[PDB]
Design a protein around this ligand. Structure first.
Ligand SMILES: O=C(O)C[C@H](NC(=O)c1nc(Cl)nc2[nH]ccc12)c1ccccc1
Length: 167
């Protein structure tokens, strides 16, 4: 039993809800919140810009130190950093950005990072400003993640489409 509330169950381990991941994080304080990161951990917009704003820019400060030490992530890769006031940890995961021309096949590799964590709160990778089809992102998620994932979809209209079109 966990603290997540109001989710629709899609499969044995994948759950979905119309919610702002920022507000959802502040309430549950999950062990892991997933960020829709880019390879530079520049959290300017989308989920990343919103999550960072909620940490009063502490996420960005920590991220800049991480990049200065380690260099950029790989597309499809991840790193674990602090969750600040939102969660114990933040798993920064880089899905392919279609608006940059990146291989959508890397979306599966991106979701594989979730399997290193027993329970996560997450957005649909490569959705939103990353330019991929959210219906596809959901399909890859369900077919790749085996741990317990609680997916937050900001747009109510998109959520209903995701639910109503789910196979
Ligand atoms: O779920 C969605 O719609 C897509 C998702 N967007 C959000 O998570 C989101 N949208 C709005 Cl508008 N306000 C927000 N506040 C806190 C979060 C948040 C997303 C994910 C990755 C890249 C780009 C977009």
């Amino acid at each position: 039993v966990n603290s997540f509330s109001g989710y629709l169950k899609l499969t044995d381990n994948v759950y979905i809800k119309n919610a702002d991941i920022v507000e959802e994080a502040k309430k549950v304080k999950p062990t892991v919140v997933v960020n829709a990161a880019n390879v530079y951990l520049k959290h300017g917009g989308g989920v990343a810009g919103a999550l960072n704003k909620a940490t009063n820019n502490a996420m960005q400060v920590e991220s800049d130190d991480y990049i200065a030490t380690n260099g950029p992530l790989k597309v499809g890769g991840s790193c674990v950093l602090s969750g600040h006031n939102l969660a114990k940890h933040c798993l920064h995961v880089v899905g392919p950005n279609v608006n940059k021309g990146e291989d959508i096949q890397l979306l599966k590799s991106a979701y594989e990072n979730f399997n290193q964590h027993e329970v996560l709160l997450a957005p649909l990778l490569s959705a939103g400003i990353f330019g991929a089809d959210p219906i596809h992102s959901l399909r890859v998620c369900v077919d790749t993640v085996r741990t317990n994932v609680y997916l937050a979809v900001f747009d109510k209209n998109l959520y209903d489409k995701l639910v109503s079109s789910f196979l």
